[PDB]
Design a binder for this molecule. Structure first.
Ligand SMILES: [Cl-]
Ligand SMILES: [Cl-]
Ligand SMILES: [Cl-]
Ligand SMILES: [Cl-]
Ligand SMILES: [Cl-]
Ligand SMILES: [Cl-]
Ligand SMILES: [Cl-]
Ligand SMILES: [Cl-]
Ligand SMILES: [Cl-]
Ligand SMILES: [Cl-]
Ligand SMILES: [Cl-]
Ligand SMILES: [Cl-]
Ligand SMILES: [Cl-]
Ligand SMILES: [Cl-]
Ligand SMILES: [Cl-]
Ligand SMILES: [Cl-]
Ligand SMILES: [Cl-]
Ligand SMILES: [K+]
Ligand SMILES: [K+]
Ligand SMILES: [Mg+2]
Ligand SMILES: [Mg+2]
Ligand SMILES: [Mg+2]
Ligand SMILES: [Mg+2]
Lengths: 235, 238, 204, 240, 230, 196, 203, 220, 247
């Protein structure tokens, strides 16, 4: 023990001598390969997601460069990590939500959607023939009884609901920033700016929101993002 | 740097290669040489046949697929028969459904698709055979080449198998003549190219040459043994 | 009718801390009697019995397949099955064959293995359970049996009075049915014993 | 590595080397480019002629995947042809099920998810190809997508794949393609292929050109022979 | 698809090392405790809950299976959720056939048999969880443990996860038969306090109880009350 | 129509069957045997639909013999009867039902003689005597009239004869000869055909 | 049942009676036969209630998922195609006569009929159900190219009222919906609000 | 059978008779036809008794798994969907005709569910062989927003109409009252029918029945 | 896939099946389990590994399983594997009863389970079950019987045997003390204790550390009982009295 290894425990999802799953641990490192960080925060009235939008090229159609996705009309998500893996998990989420509504006659709760995706990821940590997906999903929506919700699931199949959270390269620094504070849209954007040390242009982040007044998932335009950046700048 | 990457067709090497595909292609390079070429009106195949010993018959190299299509093979015999049987079946299905011959380029596409599948699945292997395909349809004569990689090529002329580089050099040298050649001239060119693959002391004989021809007024026909004699004389001595 | 091909009659009846279950003894094929000692009531426990009327082949198959399931249950659970639980096990067995049913309509009679409370029920051929506090009947002379039971049954009968009542209800009901009879067997189930009797009966 | 034999195995740094190796097969192939402009999409491919024995047209790297959709490929050509068949089937199934022509973005996303499925398992290998899809319609305008062996899919103003991708992108960046027509852009495509072609290492190539736009009424088509030849003449004379 | 060969096999000394290593995952998990009182059962567990940021109510470690059975674990959370879902399904399958709630021991046997499968079936690893299962039936309380091998044990009291050896010796000193549920809750919390670190609140522990009325989680306010005295 | 009869005495079981195979208006065989030896002390007598009768009886026969080879001893008559019933019942609602009516006669060391009746539905009844076929309608009452449980074998053969003579007198079908066998502790014995 | 839909410049009007019968017992006298399939796409249902509810629920699921994937409002023609595919494929096991009508930004107000058997045709206006037989003449005589929304609602209400008078299998209230770029406006005509036409009693 | 339901101001009232017949003979005089679905949802059943029993049991069980997972009280729409999708799949061969009522986060809801899988959401419904008699009562007397006691009266009057006018219906009236704050499962609610008092005394002595054989087996 | 396969069902170069041998080592470390046949019955006696603690005592035994009316078994080895096999034994026994309407003869039940164990050694690529079993029974063909099976799918019939910890030493003691044709249940029991006393090297033998089950015939019916702790303490006491008289 202390980093020990036997047989194929670094190659497939079997236990190491300490009871670790190295392949799952490596899937967390895969999340950071993309070099991005995302932040999410809930208050009483709304839940918000913000992530970096890096468009180094310009030969890109920047309207197709997004990590924000609509799952249903009332559930939004930000993906962090390997892009193709992420898109796959978004597709699965969309399917699960649609199937839930068809079978049960009401919209899937955000906590149930997160749990289902997490349970699907769990399988990949226990069956040897496929890898985990190297991505992390953060979901937002309004629950009719509990108000705004933010949920995160990961490649280990853990999930939780949060007051605020983060994912990607600066997850730990975002977590410290948000912990200190917790002891909404401006908090999210300030957290991300602080831990990256950037001071953003409106084209360098994306923002999505759900509110108790307007439960439909909405992606802010550049102009709407700029009204927040300017309001902050004037402290 | 090579051994862990060379046994499974599903393992990419660090250089972006698949060694099992490259190794399957060595099966074709070690097959006896065959040549294919075309004029405006005919497609011809010419093949050297190997006899294992002096008392064995020479191995067939040229196979009938349909009235309008035949093939010459190089590489694993059993894979060649499997692929030939697939081609035959696709041709029969086209005539059954549409009452017309399967266009040759469409058949080749089907071979590409079929032969690609095992290159991507664990525990399967590439086909260890290369084909030269002679055909005639509404777009005229054709010579195609298929490979264990599942790639295929539309050819003015081609040679595959052992010492086929020599044949290819002859073909490039004379290819501006082929379109306008009568059938006799075209077959002669094929035989001259094939003869370039031989050790200096060996010659084309009625025992080691096989010929396949298809064209505008000629269904795919195979010429062996005494039937290749008209074509062999012929022929400027080396 | 499929259910009248072999004929036959079963009934169960509740008393004061006792139950009774009875059956005719005829195995016949349409008009022809074949034997007069055909078993229709089967033990499922020391104080728990099932009676099956209907198509003789299925009477036997259901009793045997049920015993297979019950034996496994008792080995796994380490206890005797409760009467209500056996009812549910039988219902599940019959309803598996919802679209090609067994042609048998069981009655169950017993005492709870721990509390000794009386239980009786019947089920239709696809496993609809009916629990009652008085009596249940099944067979080709159900109407005749209802007539006798409605007229004679009383609450809280002692074992001797329960015996006479179930016996008279069976004997007189089957004597108005061409394809039931050739003898009547009766089991009286009490906390401390089982009493089994065959009755003096018409053999026509 | 030790860690680079299966697409079901992460390396300790979180890489899937089998996918990276498949990307190396693409990066060894000659260059293809796509450019979206005001009224359509134009593709061009540096098609190396490995033998003068091949017909002019052999090993096409440009495909019609639906009447309105073209596909341009680089990498292992058997894998690319397989993906073109997957794309075609997806487009055909879409029309049968929904009753209209598949939107380019949706086709790209569906084929990308198929490519992605081959990056998770020891049972199969990643495709050794990258490809572009291009379309035009009056309702959706011009659209150009590119999909790589990992299954990532993005939309582009201009794109290049294969061995001179970076050199090509730097030339594409000099064009104001948003304001240019397909008939202008073909020339530029030809020019850029000639610039990035390494005539010392690999003599002989064919230029392959296709387009889809207002001028083709939203149909993906080969560039007509006379226009290709005037584009080549422009590219050659621009090179000196 | 699926690998069809076992990933757990016998070593030359007769050990199933993947099961031993699954047990090491359990040993490094957060502590859990179970105590069978005369009139009920308590299950208690520590939340390995960093961050103020967690919504502590959003996921529960102490989970109902039926009206009368509940569970907790030590080890890998996501593996636990698999077993919770299966246990719930097993309990309903039983109820459909027998029309009686599943006896605690029957539920444990069926869940243990699932865990056994994952030590032998193709292309999977064992579960990295041990379960503590409580219930009430035949007028009597039950407490069971089911381990990664599929072995199960009936306990009067026990601990699992980090510092379990000391938790069991703490319970051996403190448990007696005729003890009541309210007292047992207290001693279960004291057992967690033995290996806690960092001040207990009603938000970083979870407690569930089982008696004649059924299984239920204690509310945060109920736990806060018991935490006064500790 | 085919006739089977069995009569169980204290320590034996006597069985007989007609020897006719008929088709349409003709007898096509007059020495047909409807009995199948399952083991040293068990006979299965089988009648019913063509094809089904032999296929079923021979399947049972092979499986009874297999049990003996696998285990080193034989199935009891009772166990063999229940095996037979299980198979027939299991087939009843399948794609391959067997339309066969049977008697099984046996002797067990410890339990003595047994006679079992089964119909095509697979209802199984143990009986002191039984018969199958239209001929049973004319003979069962003779058995009811004259049988006793202690009936000797020399009397049982006379009782059997009276039944067979009744068929010659009163039954509309031509059944002129019958196979007769008896089973006891010493195995299966062939008796003289009873012929008219 | 009687169902109907009618195109205008910028939208559609849909209507139905409200009667569901088993034999000649009225099991529901206030049935809602106009079912939303998406924001601006409805179907009008006739034939077996089990079949049309099952098919409508399935299409709603299919179209919802499609619309999320495309991130765009669905086409009316796509909704109709999905109904058609299901009604055609399962034509031997369904008794379903459907009208699909709605609005989308590409083609505006549109009406499709998917009658029993699963053909699909776009129409200016469509009628269906058992009661439609009695109003072919009326609709043929009354229809005019270029009708306004308020004229199309009147036309529909009048046609349905006529059918309901004559068809034993139709009756109750008239449910109407108008769909346009602005949304969906639903209303019920009941009792004295239902257009009235005298019985031709004798002079 | 007569089963029925109404939506009243604060909830749902369900009702049922208690006769089960086999052919034209009463088998059960006290059959329970109001089935548990969840603590806030009940379902009356008519049609083929095994099918209504097994169908309600299955959906109740699947709903319990659902609520165990969600941690929320189930919705009436969910029970409706599960029931109707299953009945549809079976093409009317499961003969369950159901009146489903409950109260969820969106308030009171009442559905009729038919064997082929059609459902109707309505403020009052009836099913079974007595359903027209019960419906006549509802058409004549239902008003929206009735108080609890008025609604209970109305439903029992409707069940009584079936009891007295349908040969397929009889014995007692059971009700189930469901609101946000309470569930009253009232079995029996009313007992309009009683067997006549017995006039002739039989009392058969010991030995009246002649016995041929006897075996006593002592137990435990 | 080929890279990660253990190849559990192949021969080694000396014709050995290594997984079977390694399973046999697991069994050798498990609780001592013995079986003795007598004229009037058969017994099983097993070391308990649920060796006490705060353990709760809820079933009638730890390692003794009733299989049907006429048979029981005990196990040594992986407990979860034993649970799978004992369930399967019960099913096989009920299938046989269903088919024949008589109880499965003892040797046939053993054989049927052993064919399953054997299959796990020959195909499927799974680990074998890590269990040896002792079976006790009565049937009408051979009366009182004792079998042993192990993970190879081999079995044999025994008058007396032992599996699990110190089995070799236990079998020596049995060879020397067992009286072929002359053992009663009373004397077999005395011997069982003598043997467990010598082979339990975990301290002075105690009733809490053993389980004993007897199988007898009474009035045409098989009786299977697990001795209560009172009876086991008495047998241990009689053994300790007898070792004193030995002087
Ligand atoms: Cl939906
Ligand atoms: Cl060759
Ligand atoms: Cl070869
Ligand atoms: Cl190639
Ligand atoms: Cl070559
Ligand atoms: Cl069964
Ligand atoms: Cl069962
Ligand atoms: Cl495998
Ligand atoms: Cl769950
Ligand atoms: Cl709770
Ligand atoms: Cl109406
Ligand atoms: Cl129609
Ligand atoms: Cl219609
Ligand atoms: Cl209609
Ligand atoms: Cl619904
Ligand atoms: Cl009814
Ligand atoms: Cl048994
Ligand atoms: K894995
Ligand atoms: K009308
Ligand atoms: Mg009678
Ligand atoms: Mg008579
Ligand atoms: Mg047949
Ligand atoms: Mg239908």
């Amino acid at each position: 023990s202390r980093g020990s290894s036997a047989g194929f425990d670094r190659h497939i999802t079997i236990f190491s001598p300490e009871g670790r799953l190295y392949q799952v641990e490596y899937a967390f490192k895969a999340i950071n390969q993309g070099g991005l960080t995302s932040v999410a925060v809930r208050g009483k009235d709304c839940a918000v997601i913000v992530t970096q939008k890096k468009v180094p090229d310009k030969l890109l159609d920047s309207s197709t460069v997004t990590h924000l996705f609509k799952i249903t009309e009332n559930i939004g998500c930000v993906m962090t990590g390997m892009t193709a893996d992420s898109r796959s998990q978004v597709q699965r989420a969309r399917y699960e939500a649609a199937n839930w509504k068809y079978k049960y006659g009401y919209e899937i709760p955000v906590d149930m959607l997160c749990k289902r995706i997490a349970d699907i990821s769990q399988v990949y940590t226990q069956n040897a023939e496929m890898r985990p997906l190297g991505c992390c999903m953060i979901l937002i929506g309004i629950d009719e009884e509990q108000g705004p919700q933010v949920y995160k699931c990961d490649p280990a199949g853990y999930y939780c609901g949060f007051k605020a959270t983060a994912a990607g390269v600066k997850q730990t620094e975002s977590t410290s920033f948000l912990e200190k504070k917790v002891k909404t849209v401006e908090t999210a954007i300030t957290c991300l700016s602080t831990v990256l040390s950037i001071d953003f242009k409106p084209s360098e982040i994306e923002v999505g929101v759900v509110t108790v007044e307007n439960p439909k998932f909405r992606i802010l335009t550049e102009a709407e993002i700029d009204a927040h950046l300017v309001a902050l700048a004037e402290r | 740097f090579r051994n862990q990457y060379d046994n499974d067709v599903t393992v990419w090497s660090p250089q972006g290669r698949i060694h099992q595909i490259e190794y399957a292609m060595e099966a074709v390079k070690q097959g006896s040489a065959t040549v294919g070429l075309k004029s405006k009106t005919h497609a011809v195949l010419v093949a050297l046949k190997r006899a294992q010993s002096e008392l064995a018959a020479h191995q067939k190299k040229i196979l009938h697929v349909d009235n309008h299509i035949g093939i010459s093979i190089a590489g694993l015999t059993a894979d060649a028969r499997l692929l030939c049987n697939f081609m035959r079946q696709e041709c029969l299905d086209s005539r059954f459904v549409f009452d017309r011959p399967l266009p040759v380029s469409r058949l080749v596409s089907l071979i590409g698709s079929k032969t690609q599948i095992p290159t991507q699945r664990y525990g399967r292997r590439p086909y260890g055979v290369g084909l030269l395909i002679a055909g005639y349809d509404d777009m005229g004569p054709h010579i195609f080449q298929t490979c264990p990689s599942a790639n295929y090529f539309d050819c003015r002329a081609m040679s595959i198998g052992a010492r086929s580089q020599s044949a290819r050099t002859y073909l490039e040298r004379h290819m501006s003549e082929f379109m306008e050649c009568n059938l006799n001239e075209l077959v002669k060119h094929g035989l001259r190219a094939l003869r370039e693959t031989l050790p200096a002391e060996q010659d084309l004989t009625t025992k080691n040459v096989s010929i396949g021809i298809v064209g505008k007024d000629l269904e795919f026909t195979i010429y062996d043994d005494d039937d290749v004699s008209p074509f062999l004389e012929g022929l400027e001595e080396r | 009718s499929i259910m009248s091909y072999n004929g036959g009659a079963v009934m169960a009846m509740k008393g004061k801390n006792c139950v009774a279950i009875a059956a005719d003894r005829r195995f016949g094929i349409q008009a022809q009697m074949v034997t007069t000692d055909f078993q229709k009531i089967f033990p499922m426990g020391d104080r728990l019995y099932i009676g099956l009327a209907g198509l003789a082949t299925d009477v036997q198959t259901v009793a045997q397949r049920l015993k297979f399931r019950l034996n496994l249950y008792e080995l796994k659970e380490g206890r005797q099955i409760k009467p209500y639980t056996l009812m549910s096990m039988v219902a599940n067995l019959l309803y598996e064959k919802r679209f090609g049913p067994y042609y048998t309509e069981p009655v169950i009679a017993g005492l709870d293995p721990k509390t000794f409370k009386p239980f009786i029920c019947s089920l239709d051929l696809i496993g609809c359970p009916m629990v009652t506090d008085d009596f249940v009947v099944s067979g080709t002379c159900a109407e005749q049996m209802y007539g006798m039971c409605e007229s004679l049954w009383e609450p809280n009968m002692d074992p001797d009075h329960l015996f006479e009542t179930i016996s008279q209800a069976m004997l007189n009901a089957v004597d108005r049915d061409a394809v039931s009879g050739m003898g009547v067997i009766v089991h009286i189930i009490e906390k401390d014993k089982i009493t089994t009797r065959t009755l003096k009966a018409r053999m026509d | 590595t030790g860690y680079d034999l299966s697409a079901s195995t992460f390396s300790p740094d979180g890489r899937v080397f089998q996918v990276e190796y498949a990307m190396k097969a693409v990066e060894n192939s000659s260059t293809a480019i796509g450019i979206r402009c005001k009224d359509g999409v134009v593709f061009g491919v540096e098609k190396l002629v490995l033998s003068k024995l091949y017909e002019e047209g052999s090993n096409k790297r440009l495909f019609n995947v639906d009447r309105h959709v073209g596909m341009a490929v680089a990498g292992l050509l058997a894998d690319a042809r397989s993906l073109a068949d997957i794309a075609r089937e997806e487009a055909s199934n879409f029309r049968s099920n929904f009753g209209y022509n598949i939107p380019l973005k949706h086709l790209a996303d569906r084929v990308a998810m198929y490519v992605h499925a081959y990056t998770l398992y020891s049972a199969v290998r990643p495709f050794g190809c990258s490809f572009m899809l291009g379309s035009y319609s009056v309702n959706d305008g011009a659209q150009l997508y590119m999909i790589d062996p990992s299954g990532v899919s993005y939309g582009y103003w201009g794109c290049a794949i294969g061995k001179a991708r970076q050199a090509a992108k730097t030339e594409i960046e000099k064009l104001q393609m948003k304001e240019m027509t397909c008939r202008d852009i073909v020339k530029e495509v030809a020019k850029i292929i000639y610039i990035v072609h390494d005539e010392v290492k690999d003599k002989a190539f064919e230029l392959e050109l296709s387009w889809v736009g207002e001028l083709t009424n939203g149909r993906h088509e080969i560039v007509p022979k006379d226009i290709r030849e005037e584009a080549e003449k422009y590219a050659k004379e621009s090179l000196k | 698809r699926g690998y069809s060969f076992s990933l757990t096999t016998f070593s030359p000394s007769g050990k199933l090392v993947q099961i031993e290593y699954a047990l090491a995952a359990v040993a490094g998990g957060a502590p859990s405790v179970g105590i069978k009182a005369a009139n009920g059962v308590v299950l208690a567990t520590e939340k390995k809950q960093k961050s103020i940021l967690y919504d502590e109510r959003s996921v529960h470690k102490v989970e109902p299976i039926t009206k009368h059975i509940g569970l907790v674990y030590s080890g890998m959370g996501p593996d636990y959720r698999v077993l919770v879902h299966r246990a719930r399904k097993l309990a309903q399958q039983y109820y459909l056939v027998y029309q009686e709630p599943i006896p605690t021991a029957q539920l444990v046997q069926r869940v243990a048999s699932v865990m056994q499968e994952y030590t032998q079936s193709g292309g999977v690893r064992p579960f990295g969880v041990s379960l503590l299962i409580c219930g009430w039936n035949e007028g009597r309380p039950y407490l069971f443990q089911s381990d990664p091998s599929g072995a199960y044990f009936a306990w009067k009291a026990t601990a699992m996860g980090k510092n379990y050896v000391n938790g069991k010796t703490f319970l051996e000193k403190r448990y007696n038969e005729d003890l009541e549920l309210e007292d047992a809750i207290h001693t279960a919390i004291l057992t967690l306090k033995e290996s806690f670190e960092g001040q207990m609140t009603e938000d970083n522990i979870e407690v569930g109880i089982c008696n004649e009325a059924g299984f239920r989680r204690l509310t945060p306010t109920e736990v806060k009350d018991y935490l006064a005295a500790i | 129509m085919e006739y089977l009869i069995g009569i169980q005495g204290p320590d034996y079981v006597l069985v007989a069957s007609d020897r006719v195979a008929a088709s349409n208006i003709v007898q096509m065989k007059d020495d047909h045997d409807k009995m199948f030896k399952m083991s040293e002390k068990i006979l299965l007598l089988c009648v019913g639909e063509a094809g089904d009768t032999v296929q079923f009886a021979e399947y049972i026969q092979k499986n009874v013999q297999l049990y003996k080879m696998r285990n080193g001893y034989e199935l009891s008559p009772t166990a063999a009867a229940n095996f037979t019933r299980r198979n027939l019942a299991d087939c009843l609602r399948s794609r391959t039902p067997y339309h066969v009516n049977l008697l099984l006669a046996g002797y067990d060391e410890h339990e003595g003689p047994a006679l079992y009746y089964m119909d095509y539905l697979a209802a199984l009844a143990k009986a002191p005597f039984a018969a199958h076929g239209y001929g049973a309608f004319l003979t069962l009452s003779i058995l009811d009239r004259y049988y006793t449980p202690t009936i000797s074998r020399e009397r049982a053969v006379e009782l059997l004869r009276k039944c067979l003579e009744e068929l010659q007198k009163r039954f509309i079908l031509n059944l002129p000869t019958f196979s007769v066998r008896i089973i006891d502790k010493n195995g299966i014995h062939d008796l003289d055909n009873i012929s008219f | 049942t009687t169902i109907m839909a009618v195109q205008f410049d910028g939208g559609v009007v849909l209507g139905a009676d409200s009667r569901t019968t088993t034999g000649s017992y009225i099991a529901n006298r206030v049935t809602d036969k106009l079912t939303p399939i998406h924001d601006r796409i409805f179907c009008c249902r006739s034939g077996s209630a089990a079949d049309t509810q099952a098919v409508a629920d399935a299409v709603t699921y299919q179209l919802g998922f499609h619309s999320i994937e495309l991130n765009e409002p669905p086409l009316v023609h796509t909704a109709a195609s999905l109904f058609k595919e299901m009604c055609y494929r399962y034509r031997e096991d369904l008794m379903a006569g459907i009208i699909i009508a709605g609005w989308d930004p590409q083609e505006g107000g549109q009406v499709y009929s998917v009658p029993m058997g699963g053909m699909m045709v776009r129409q200016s206006f469509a009628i269906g159900g058992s009661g439609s037989s009695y109003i072919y003449g009326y609709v043929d005589a009354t229809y005019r190219e270029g009708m306004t929304k308020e004229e199309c609602l009147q036309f529909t209400a009048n046609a349905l009222a006529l059918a309901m008078e004559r068809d034993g299998s139709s009756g109750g209230v008239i449910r109407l919906a108008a769909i346009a770029e602005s949304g969906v406006e639903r209303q019920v005509l009941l009792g004295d609000q239902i257009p009235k036409f005298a019985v031709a009693t004798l002079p | 059978t007569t089963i029925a339901g109404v939506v009243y101001k604060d909830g749902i009232v369900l009702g049922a008779d208690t006769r089960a017949t086999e052919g034209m003979v009463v088998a059960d005089k006290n059959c329970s036809k109001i089935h548990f679905i969840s603590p806030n949802i009940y379902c009356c059943g008519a049609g083929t008794a095994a099918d209504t029993d097994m169908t309600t049991q299955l959906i109740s069980s699947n709903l319990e798994l659902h609520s165990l997972s969600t941690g929320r009280l189930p919705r009436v729409v969910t029970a409706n969907r599960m029931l109707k999708q299953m009945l549809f799949r079976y093409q009317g061969y499961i003969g369950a005709a159901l009146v489903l009522g409950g109260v969820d986060v969106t308030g009171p809801h009442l559905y009729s569910i038919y064997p082929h899988g059609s459902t109707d959401k309505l403020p009052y419904v009836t099913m079974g062989s007595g359903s027209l008699a019960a419906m006549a009562v509802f058409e004549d007397k239902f008003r929206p927003d009735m108080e609890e006691e008025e609604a209970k009266n109305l439903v029992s009057e409707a069940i009584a109409a079936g009891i007295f006018n349908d040969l397929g219906s009889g014995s007692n009236i059971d009700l189930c009252v469901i609101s946000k704050n309470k569930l009253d499962f009232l079995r029996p609610y009313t007992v309009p029918n009683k067997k006549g008092t017995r006039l002739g005394r039989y009392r058969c002595e010991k030995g009246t029945t002649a016995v041929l054989t006897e075996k006593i087996t002592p137990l435990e | 896939s080929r890279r990660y396969d253990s190849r559990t069902t192949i021969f080694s170069p000396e014709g050995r099946l290594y997984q079977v041998e390694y399973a046999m080592e697991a069994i050798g470390h498990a609780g001592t389990c013995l079986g003795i046949l007598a004229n009037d019955g058969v017994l099983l006696a097993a070391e308990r590994r649920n060796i006490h603690k705060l353990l709760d005592e809820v079933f009638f035994s730890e390692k003794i399983y009733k299989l049907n009316e006429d048979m029981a078994c005990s196990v040594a080895g992986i407990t979860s594997d034993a649970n799978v096999l004992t369930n399967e034994l019960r099913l096989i026994a009920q299938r046989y009863l269903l088919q024949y309407q008589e109880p499965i003869p003892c040797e046939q039940l053993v054989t049927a389970l052993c064919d399953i164990k054997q299959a796990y050694t020959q195909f499927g690529g799974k680990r074998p079950f890590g269990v040896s079993l002792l079976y006790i029974g009565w049937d009408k063909h051979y009366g009182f019987q004792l079998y042993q099976s192990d993970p190879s799918g081999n079995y044999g019939g025994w008058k007396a045997t032992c599996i699990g910890n110190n089995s070799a030493a236990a079998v020596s003691m049995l060879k020397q003390d067992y009286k072929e044709g002359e053992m009663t249940l009373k004397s077999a029991l005395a011997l069982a204790i003598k043997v467990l006393n010598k082979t339990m090297d975990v301290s002075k033998l105690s009733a809490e550390k053993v389980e004993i089950a007897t199988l007898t015939r009474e009035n045409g019916k098989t009786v299977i009982r697990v001795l209560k702790q009172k009876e086991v303490e008495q047998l241990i006491k009689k053994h300790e009295e007898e070792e004193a008289k030995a002087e």
